Design a protein around this ligand. Structure first.
Ligand SMILES: [K+]
Ligand SMILES: [K+]
Ligand SMILES: [K+]
Ligand SMILES: [K+]
Ligand SMILES: [K+]
Ligand SMILES: [Mg+2]
Ligand SMILES: [Mg+2]
Ligand SMILES: [Mg+2]
Ligand SMILES: [Mg+2]
Ligand SMILES: [Mg+2]
Ligand SMILES: [Mg+2]
Ligand SMILES: [Mg+2]
Ligand SMILES: [Mg+2]
Ligand SMILES: [Mg+2]
Ligand SMILES: [Mg+2]
Ligand SMILES: [Mg+2]
Ligand SMILES: [Mg+2]
Ligand SMILES: [Mg+2]
Ligand SMILES: [Mg+2]
Ligand SMILES: [Mg+2]
Ligand SMILES: [Mg+2]
Ligand SMILES: [Mg+2]
Ligand SMILES: [Mg+2]
Ligand SMILES: [Mg+2]
Ligand SMILES: [Mg+2]
Ligand SMILES: [Mg+2]
Ligand SMILES: [Mg+2]
Ligand SMILES: [Mg+2]
Ligand SMILES: [Mg+2]
Ligand SMILES: [Mg+2]
Ligand SMILES: [Mg+2]
Ligand SMILES: [Mg+2]
Ligand SMILES: [Mg+2]
Ligand SMILES: [Mg+2]
Ligand SMILES: [Mg+2]
Ligand SMILES: [Mg+2]
Ligand SMILES: [Mg+2]
Ligand SMILES: [Mg+2]
Ligand SMILES: [Mg+2]
Ligand SMILES: [Mg+2]
Lengths: 274, 43, 91
RNA sequence: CCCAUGUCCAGGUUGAAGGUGCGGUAAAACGCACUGGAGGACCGAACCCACGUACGUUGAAAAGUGCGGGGAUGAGGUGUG
RNA sequence: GUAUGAGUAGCGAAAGACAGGUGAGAAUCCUGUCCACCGUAUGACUAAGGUUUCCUGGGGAAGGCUCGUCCGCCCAGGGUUAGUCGGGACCUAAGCCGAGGCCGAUAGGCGUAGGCGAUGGACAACAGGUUGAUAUUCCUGUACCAGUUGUUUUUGUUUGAGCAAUGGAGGGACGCAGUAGGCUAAGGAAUGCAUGCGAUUGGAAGUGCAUGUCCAAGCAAUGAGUCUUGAGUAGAGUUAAAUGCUUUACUCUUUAAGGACAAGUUGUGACGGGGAGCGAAAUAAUAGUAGCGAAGUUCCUGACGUCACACUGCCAAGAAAAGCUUCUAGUGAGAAAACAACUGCCCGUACCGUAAACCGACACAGGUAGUCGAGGAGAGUAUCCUAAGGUGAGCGAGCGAACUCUCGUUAAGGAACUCGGCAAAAUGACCCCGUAACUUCGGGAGAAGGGGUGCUGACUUCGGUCAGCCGCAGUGAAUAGGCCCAAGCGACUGUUUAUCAAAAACACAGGUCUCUGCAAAAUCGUAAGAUGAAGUAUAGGGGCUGACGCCUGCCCGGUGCUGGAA
RNA sequence: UGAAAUUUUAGUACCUGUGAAGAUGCAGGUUACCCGCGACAGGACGGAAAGACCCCAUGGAGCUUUACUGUAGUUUGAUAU
């Protein structure tokens, strides 16, 4: 659920957070861990390529089976766990052959619940089926785009796709963001929503807590100098003395679309919202 | 009042060293200019 | 290198004489040398059975004569401690 | 500014959630105590910073000293690479 | 090059005085006695950096802001000893290089394998002495790690003991805060104990004065205690195998038992060494130096040092790799222990190190990582005075003018000064009482405002309390808030023009709009390639606003954008 | 013991006036033995600095844009692969 801290201090005033009711352990598995270098927006060349990042708490990477290659071998849930690299929670599963693994803990999942994959699999949460073998109307998550690449699309919190039809070799899929799309039918997906629908509600209350979340400060270009941003400069406080407010480069900020108009997937996209 | 030269043998030789200069191409020019000049301290 | 060019000379000093009176002798050595080579060298040069060998390498000592300044050469000084039931090297 | 790896923050204080018990209830909201020990919380050394003032202003100093000053478990200070 | 200013400013924060000595010459050097300064340091370790500044013996040409017989200066000599300390012959992070390869006017850029690379991980020693200068290094004892040869005792010889992988597994292996608790440094130096001595200034041979009031590493045993349920069937899998590892069901046990882990304690080590002090000639012992050597208890306090990230809680969810253990695959006729002996490389090791040796042009009032850092009073590393120990500031003497600076008092008044209460003054610790408007019910609040505080006896059930005494005054000194009323700005903690602006400026949580379906969008770059992301619309990027509350009206004609289409 | 800035030479008075228009130095008149010490700071249009205000230069640099001319990118099409 959500915690609502009392207002002892002006930082803690209107803060909220999660009580982490759905988590059974703070004790992850020593095998599925890998390290993370925080890049802080820097790149191969050391230059800032993505602003407003870096400087927070250390993290590890938790190897997750988005692919679900393993078929006709069940897997029983033991624990739900915090993953800092994402918004959602995760879950530990032992395959009966003894393989340990993490997966993306869907909504309505509980310890002891048992999961499978393949066409013979059943229409229940946590089970990874190809879009061939999934009926219309069902909510899914952990969708992939190319077979064997692994789940790409529906992996974050409180997200929910929905099958809506087919066209032969493809499947028609509504996504979060309202976009309808044709997706290759042999792509695997898992049933249900993704997990903690309450993460959207968390107020943060502290700049320092944003820092812990690795988010540097955003500086506005209406205050920078003219060399620094196209909105910079001006005596006193300046409006946007331009048409089409812009990025630090010449890209407009509002309205200008950025999808390549040569995109091969435009034939697949049926109805887009964004 | 802290100052600009906080010495360090390691940083000095890792930046301004023979290995570094001879590794880069444009350090080959520097060293060869110490010699044409006729330096006793090539690095 | 060769065992006799390993060793160069002894070090006649007060400390070294005080060590001679405790049965361990100082020797200047090739700067590229090794402790086991000093051992082999003395054992072949005196038929004395060596017990232990210490080594120092001395920095070059600044000097000057008029306008011109420079450095004394580097040195390596071994200290060869002998056994009992052994001879005492005569210098 | 950032990456990794380490390290430092005397002492004292206040007393959030949660929990327990006793009331009260048809049972609860609720209340009273105790526990607990949170905080970009408080006072204040080192540490960090530089608000004012005087002095210095061919300075002890190519930006300081003194008298006070602000922060001081964090968005902290600092070291090495 | 030499004048001018001018023999002027300055001689760089602070306490020295005296007697003797050395010497041509003494405020300045040496010895000594008093005195003062530091003491969470102005002390003792030590990384970096410096790189010979260290020690001895001479010197006073220059340097030292004076002098100088002296020095971190000059001259001649010497000085740094490691199987165990730190680093390499061990491991790897960030980052770097990079076979081949990819990309590219050239040059080259990127990057895989594989390497490098500590600030981390792993890794076998410590007590004393000793030099003029080195000390876990040298010396004496006592060990420990890896290895070699030999002797002795065992057992394996190919249905084969043992070694055993780069292969499989485990382990290594980790955050922040918060208290309890145990143990031990440490301290009181309270107590006893040992040694020495009765003070001439009025008193004291006693509950007088002073000083001290120990010892490893290793071996053995023990252990405050702390973690962890563990055994067994049917199995599936562990790129092939496996007695090892993982796990699905199933039974029994779970205050338990078993298995690990442990600070520390005791006995040895130790018939040794240290140690108050006493104290040798033949004297460069021109001694306090060889040398000799007592006792080393009890009680109280008591550590975030350690057990130990052990436990609890929390969210921001907290390196890896190798050593190490096991498994077999493989290999295999030699291996295990006891004893004796032997071997163990390379670099650093001096000295400075909150500084006159580093960085600042200087022997510069600046800055310089970490460890130890005692006592009384005290919560305390604050503060005052002291301990161990270390210093006495590299110009002085006198006279005690104006004026400048740093300080201290002040009649009466009390902000009349002033741009302005600037500066200074006043308050300041602890205990108790008491404490408003307003409020996001948390606060405001240490509000305000008051009172008390010393000493000596009784008294408690240990803090209150009573009585008495003294002073102008009792946190008697030092160290510690001035407060209140109201208004504007910004909500807040924070950041900001290194060197004239600390702010109402920036950020901030929050809000909104917009883009983006994943080879994203955006960005760096010729491109490869990379960030974004080892993320995936509750995610990310960009613009604006800026906590919270009530709100956020009308305008799409214009300029843009989006979509459309004859 | 031992500098520095500055410095055309200097035996370097005052009033009034003159004068590149505000004189230690020219004039007329007046006052004033020579040399110093400590203090002050009215002047030497004092020192420091080729005015930063202003104007000029067919000077420069940064910045803006519905100034000009271009261009990297973005996009559309033709053609080749
Ligand atoms: K290290
Ligand atoms: K103290
Ligand atoms: K319009
Ligand atoms: K004047
Ligand atoms: K211009
Ligand atoms: Mg601005
Ligand atoms: Mg612009
Ligand atoms: Mg305006
Ligand atoms: Mg503008
Ligand atoms: Mg050595
Ligand atoms: Mg605070
Ligand atoms: Mg404070
Ligand atoms: Mg510091
Ligand atoms: Mg300022
Ligand atoms: Mg003068
Ligand atoms: Mg001085
Ligand atoms: Mg102090
Ligand atoms: Mg000396
Ligand atoms: Mg002199
Ligand atoms: Mg000398
Ligand atoms: Mg490269
Ligand atoms: Mg690598
Ligand atoms: Mg008497
Ligand atoms: Mg030393
Ligand atoms: Mg001095
Ligand atoms: Mg008065
Ligand atoms: Mg007035
Ligand atoms: Mg004031
Ligand atoms: Mg007081
Ligand atoms: Mg007004
Ligand atoms: Mg503010
Ligand atoms: Mg502030
Ligand atoms: Mg400033
Ligand atoms: Mg704003
Ligand atoms: Mg004029
Ligand atoms: Mg005139
Ligand atoms: Mg004339
Ligand atoms: Mg004079
Ligand atoms: Mg002038
Ligand atoms: Mg000019």
């Amino acid at each position: 659920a959500i915690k609502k801290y009392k207002p002892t201090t002006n930082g803690r005033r209107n803060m909220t957070s999660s009580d982490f009711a759905e988590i059974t352990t703070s004790t992850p598995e020593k095998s599925l861990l890998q390290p993370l270098k925080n890049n802080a927006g820097r790149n191969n060349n050391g230059r800032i390529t993505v602003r407003h990042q870096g400087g927070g708490h250390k993290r590890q990477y938790r190897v997750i089976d988005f692919k679900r290659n393993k078929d006709n071998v069940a897997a029983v849930v033991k624990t739900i766990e915090y993953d800092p690299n994402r918004s959602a929670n995760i879950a530990l599963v032992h395959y009966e052959d003894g393989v340990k693994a993490y997966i993306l803990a869907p909504k309505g999942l509980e310890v002891g619940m048992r999961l499978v994959s393949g066409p013979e699999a059943d229409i229940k949460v946590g089970n990874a089926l190809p879009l061939e073998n999934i009926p219309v109307g069902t909510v899914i998550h952990n969708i992939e785009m190319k077979p064997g690449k692994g789940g790409q699309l529906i992996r974050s919190a409180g997200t929910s796709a929905q099958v809506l039809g087919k066209e032969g070799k493809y499947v028609l899929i509504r996504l979060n963001s309202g976009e309808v799309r044709m997706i290759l039918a042999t792509c695997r997906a898992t049933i249900g929503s993704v997990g903690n629908e309450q993460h959207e509600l968390i107020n943060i209350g502290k700049a320092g807590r944003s820092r812990w979340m690795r988010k540097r400060p955003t500086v506005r270009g209406s205050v920078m100098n003219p060399n620094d941003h196209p909105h910079g400069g001006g005596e006193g406080k300046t409006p946007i003395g331009r048409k089409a407010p812009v990025s630090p480069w010449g890209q407009p900020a509002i309205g200008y679309k950025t999808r390549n108009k040569k995109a091969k997937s435009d034939k697949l996209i049926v109805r887009r919202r964004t | 009042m802290k100052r600009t030269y906080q010495p360090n043998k390691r940083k000095r030789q890792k930046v301004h060293g023979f290995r570094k200069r001879m590794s880069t191409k444009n350090g080959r020019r520097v060293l060869a200019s110490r010699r044409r000049k006729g330096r006793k301290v090539i690095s | 290198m060769e065992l006799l060019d390993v060793i160069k000379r002894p070090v006649i000093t007060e400390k070294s004489m005080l060590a001679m009176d405790e049965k361990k002798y100082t020797f200047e050595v090739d700067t590229r040398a090794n402790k086991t080579l000093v051992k082999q060298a003395v054992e072949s040069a005196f038929d004395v059975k060596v017990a232990n060998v210490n080594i120092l390498n001395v920095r070059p000592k600044f000097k000057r004569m008029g306008k011109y300044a420079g450095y004394t050469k580097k040195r390596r000084k071994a200290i060869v401690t002998l056994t009992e039931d052994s001879k005492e090297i005569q210098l």
